[PDB]
Scaffold this active site. Structure first.
Site, PDB file in Angstrom:
ATOM      1  N   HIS A   1       0.822  -1.226   0.000  1.00 29.84           N
ATOM      2  CA  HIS A   1       0.000   0.000   0.000  1.00 29.84           C
ATOM      3  C   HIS A   1       0.850   1.268   0.000  1.00 29.84           C
ATOM      4  O   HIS A   1       0.426   2.310  -0.507  1.00 29.84           O
ATOM      5  CB  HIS A   1      -0.930   0.021   1.214  1.00 29.84           C
ATOM      6  CG  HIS A   1      -1.761  -1.217   1.349  1.00 29.84           C
ATOM      7  ND1 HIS A   1      -2.802  -1.510   0.492  1.00 29.84           N
ATOM      8  CD2 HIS A   1      -1.686  -2.248   2.221  1.00 29.84           C
ATOM      9  CE1 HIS A   1      -3.351  -2.659   0.849  1.00 29.84           C
ATOM     10  NE2 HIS A   1      -2.697  -3.125   1.897  1.00 29.84           N
TER      11      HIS A   1
ATOM     12  N   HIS B   1       5.849   7.072   6.328  1.00 25.52           N
ATOM     13  CA  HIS B   1       5.549   6.642   4.967  1.00 25.52           C
ATOM     14  C   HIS B   1       4.981   7.830   4.217  1.00 25.52           C
ATOM     15  O   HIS B   1       4.766   8.906   4.801  1.00 25.52           O
ATOM     16  CB  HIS B   1       4.516   5.510   4.965  1.00 25.52           C
ATOM     17  CG  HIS B   1       3.230   5.890   5.605  1.00 25.52           C
ATOM     18  ND1 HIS B   1       3.003   5.750   6.959  1.00 25.52           N
ATOM     19  CD2 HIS B   1       2.121   6.468   5.089  1.00 25.52           C
ATOM     20  CE1 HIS B   1       1.791   6.202   7.242  1.00 25.52           C
ATOM     21  NE2 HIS B   1       1.243   6.659   6.131  1.00 25.52           N
TER      22      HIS B   1
ATOM     23  N   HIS C   1       2.138   9.069   0.866  1.00 30.22           N
ATOM     24  CA  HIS C   1       1.102   8.839  -0.138  1.00 30.22           C
ATOM     25  C   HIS C   1       1.424   9.754  -1.308  1.00 30.22           C
ATOM     26  O   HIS C   1       1.857  10.885  -1.092  1.00 30.22           O
ATOM     27  CB  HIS C   1      -0.264   9.189   0.427  1.00 30.22           C
ATOM     28  CG  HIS C   1      -0.577   8.454   1.683  1.00 30.22           C
ATOM     29  ND1 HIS C   1      -1.338   7.304   1.694  1.00 30.22           N
ATOM     30  CD2 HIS C   1      -0.194   8.668   2.962  1.00 30.22           C
ATOM     31  CE1 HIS C   1      -1.433   6.860   2.936  1.00 30.22           C
ATOM     32  NE2 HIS C   1      -0.728   7.656   3.718  1.00 30.22           N
TER      33      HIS C   1
ATOM     34  N   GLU D   1      -3.269  13.430   0.743  1.00 31.90           N
ATOM     35  CA  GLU D   1      -4.516  12.980   1.340  1.00 31.90           C
ATOM     36  C   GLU D   1      -5.263  14.201   1.896  1.00 31.90           C
ATOM     37  O   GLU D   1      -6.382  14.504   1.447  1.00 31.90           O
ATOM     38  CB  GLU D   1      -4.208  11.943   2.421  1.00 31.90           C
ATOM     39  CG  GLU D   1      -3.461  10.733   1.866  1.00 31.90           C
ATOM     40  CD  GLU D   1      -3.784   9.476   2.622  1.00 31.90           C
ATOM     41  OE1 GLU D   1      -3.435   9.397   3.815  1.00 31.90           O
ATOM     42  OE2 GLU D   1      -4.431   8.587   2.030  1.00 31.90           O
TER      43      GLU D   1
ATOM     44  N   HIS E   1       3.733  11.055   6.274  1.00 32.87           N
ATOM     45  CA  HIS E   1       3.102  10.769   7.561  1.00 32.87           C
ATOM     46  C   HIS E   1       4.113  10.180   8.492  1.00 32.87           C
ATOM     47  O   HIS E   1       4.621   9.080   8.229  1.00 32.87           O
ATOM     48  CB  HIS E   1       1.953   9.790   7.352  1.00 32.87           C
ATOM     49  CG  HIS E   1       0.780  10.425   6.690  1.00 32.87           C
ATOM     50  ND1 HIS E   1      -0.234   9.710   6.089  1.00 32.87           N
ATOM     51  CD2 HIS E   1       0.479  11.730   6.522  1.00 32.87           C
ATOM     52  CE1 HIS E   1      -1.115  10.556   5.581  1.00 32.87           C
ATOM     53  NE2 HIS E   1      -0.709  11.786   5.838  1.00 32.87           N
TER      54      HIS E   1
ATOM     55  N   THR F   1      -5.926   6.754   7.718  1.00 32.03           N
ATOM     56  CA  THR F   1      -6.465   6.997   6.379  1.00 32.03           C
ATOM     57  C   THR F   1      -6.521   5.742   5.506  1.00 32.03           C
ATOM     58  O   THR F   1      -6.891   5.838   4.346  1.00 32.03           O
ATOM     59  CB  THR F   1      -5.660   8.057   5.608  1.00 32.03           C
ATOM     60  OG1 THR F   1      -4.352   7.549   5.350  1.00 32.03           O
ATOM     61  CG2 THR F   1      -5.592   9.373   6.381  1.00 32.03           C
ATOM     62  N   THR F   2      -6.135   4.593   6.051  1.00 29.57           N
ATOM     63  CA  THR F   2      -6.319   3.317   5.349  1.00 29.57           C
ATOM     64  C   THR F   2      -7.047   2.387   6.301  1.00 29.57           C
ATOM     65  O   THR F   2      -7.025   2.608   7.513  1.00 29.57           O
ATOM     66  CB  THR F   2      -5.000   2.630   4.933  1.00 29.57           C
ATOM     67  OG1 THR F   2      -4.391   1.964   6.054  1.00 29.57           O
ATOM     68  CG2 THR F   2      -4.009   3.616   4.305  1.00 29.57           C
TER      69      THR F   2
HETATM   70  N1  LIG Z   1      -2.764  -3.824  11.761  1.00 23.12           N
HETATM   71  C1  LIG Z   1      -2.639  -2.723  11.418  1.00 23.12           C
HETATM   72  C2  LIG Z   1      -2.488  -1.505  11.018  1.00 23.12           C
HETATM   73  C3  LIG Z   1      -2.356  -1.248   9.654  1.00 23.12           C
HETATM   74  C4  LIG Z   1      -2.198   0.064   9.205  1.00 23.12           C
HETATM   75  C5  LIG Z   1      -2.119   1.104  10.123  1.00 23.12           C
HETATM   76  C6  LIG Z   1      -1.985   2.532   9.692  1.00 23.12           C
HETATM   77  C7  LIG Z   1      -1.098   3.455  10.295  1.00 23.12           C
HETATM   78  C8  LIG Z   1      -1.068   4.800   9.857  1.00 23.12           C
HETATM   79  C9  LIG Z   1      -1.901   5.254   8.818  1.00 23.12           C
HETATM   80  S1  LIG Z   1      -1.917   6.817   8.318  1.00 23.12           S
HETATM   81  N2  LIG Z   1      -1.961   6.884   6.720  1.00 23.12           N
HETATM   82  O1  LIG Z   1      -3.159   7.332   8.833  1.00 23.12           O
HETATM   83  O2  LIG Z   1      -0.718   7.501   8.789  1.00 23.12           O
HETATM   84  C10 LIG Z   1      -2.777   4.320   8.242  1.00 23.12           C
HETATM   85  C11 LIG Z   1      -2.817   2.988   8.668  1.00 23.12           C
HETATM   86  C12 LIG Z   1      -2.285   0.846  11.490  1.00 23.12           C
HETATM   87  C13 LIG Z   1      -2.456  -0.463  11.942  1.00 23.12           C
HETATM   88 ZN   LIG Z   2      -0.467   7.653   5.812  1.00 24.60          ZN
END
Ligand SMILES: N#Cc1ccc(-c2ccc(S(N)(=O)=O)cc2)cc1
Ligand SMILES: [Zn+2]
Ligand SMILES: N#Cc1ccc(-c2ccc(S(N)(=O)=O)cc2)cc1
Length: 258
Positions: free
Chosen positions: A62, A92, A94, A104, A117, A196-197
């Site tokens: 992703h 990471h 996007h 985003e 992020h 956001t995912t």
């Molecule tokens: N299991 C698990 C699990 C998978 C993905 C995340 C996650 C972390 C940060 C973001 S973001 N884009 O908001 O910074 C999105 C998703 C957390 C836990």
């Molecule tokens: Zn993110």
């Protein structure tokens, strides 16, 4: 087959497996800079990354995560809207298929080329897995990327991407200094939101910096050479891995600056 960013598994589909996708504190949002409230009572952000220990870089299918040793208070975010101490676990990005999209969050509907992020968890919850289950579990520092001059602090990240082209690939990534990714000013907006995912959990205090960083065309081009797929599966470029703006609903965005 699972959630993603394609025609058939993208953001408009996510609610079917993750019903919180239609919740009351979903991210990202458009930041209307004219409706945001200046709060002179908000503290300066405290970003203490001098002792950060990066470990690995991972293509998770992703995005790619640069992961840190979060077993001690080595790289921490405090102050601002936050109560207590949040520990850096990973960062990471996007990004878009084109320079005109990729972020985003948006600013008065403006989309940037990418968004960084830096993900931190509230130490009072002991680890990341427990923190995501709490309403104030995470603090994500978001930083916009525009295309212009190169960001020298990003180049070590860009150069290792060839070794993690496909989903599931990881590489050693030590001694990376995340201070090299920050803009000059720590002026910010802040609001309560979510991942956001998927799983889209409503566990994030969002802190989005006003000042974007500049990266070069070549740097963002190299992000676009990554693949969503595993090695030996059909090649689909990892581009447009962003969720669009979600309804603000019953939320106020606060600003640290006039
Ligand atoms: N299991 C698990 C699990 C998978 C993905 C995340 C996650 C972390 C940060 C973001 S973001 N884009 O908001 O910074 C999105 C998703 C957390 C836990
Ligand atoms: Zn993110
Ligand atoms: N062939 C095929 C095929 C296409 C799409 C899916 C799918 C899976 C999960 C979701 S989601 N985003 O709700 O988790 C959406 C779509 C499965 C198989």
């Amino acid at each position: 087959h699972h959630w993603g960013y394609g025609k058939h598994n993208g953001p408009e589909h996510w609610h079917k497996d993750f019903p919180i996708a239609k919740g009351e504190r979903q991210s990202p949002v458009d930041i209307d800079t004219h409706t945001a409230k200046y709060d002179p009572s908000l503290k300066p952000l405290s970003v203490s990354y001098d002792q950060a220990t990066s470990l690995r870089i991972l293509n998770n299918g992703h995005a790619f995560n640069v992961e840190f040793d979060d077993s001690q208070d080595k790289a921490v975010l405090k102050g601002g809207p936050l109560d207590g101490t949040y520990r850096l676990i990973q960062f990471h990005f996007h990004w878009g298929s084109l320079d005109g999209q990729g972020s985003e969050h948006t600013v008065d509907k403006k989309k940037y080329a990418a968004e960084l992020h830096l993900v931190h968890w509230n130490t009072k919850y002991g680890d990341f897995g427990k923190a995501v289950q709490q309403p104030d579990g995470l603090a994500v520092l978001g930083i916009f990327l525009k295309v212009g001059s190169a960001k020298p602090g990003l180049q070590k990240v860009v150069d290792v991407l060839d070794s993690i082209k496909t989903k599931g690939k990881s590489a050693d990534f030590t001694n990376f200094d995340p201070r090299g990714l920050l803009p000059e000013s720590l002026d910010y907006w802040t609001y309560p939101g979510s991942l956001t995912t998927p799983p889209l959990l409503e566990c994030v205090t969002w802190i989005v910096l006003k000042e974007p960083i500049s990266v070069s065309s070549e740097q963002v081009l190299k992000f676009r050479k990554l693949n969503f797929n595993g090695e030996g599966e059909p090649e689909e470029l990892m581009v447009d891995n962003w969720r669009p703006a979600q309804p603000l609903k019953n939320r106020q965005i606060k600003a640290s600056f006039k």
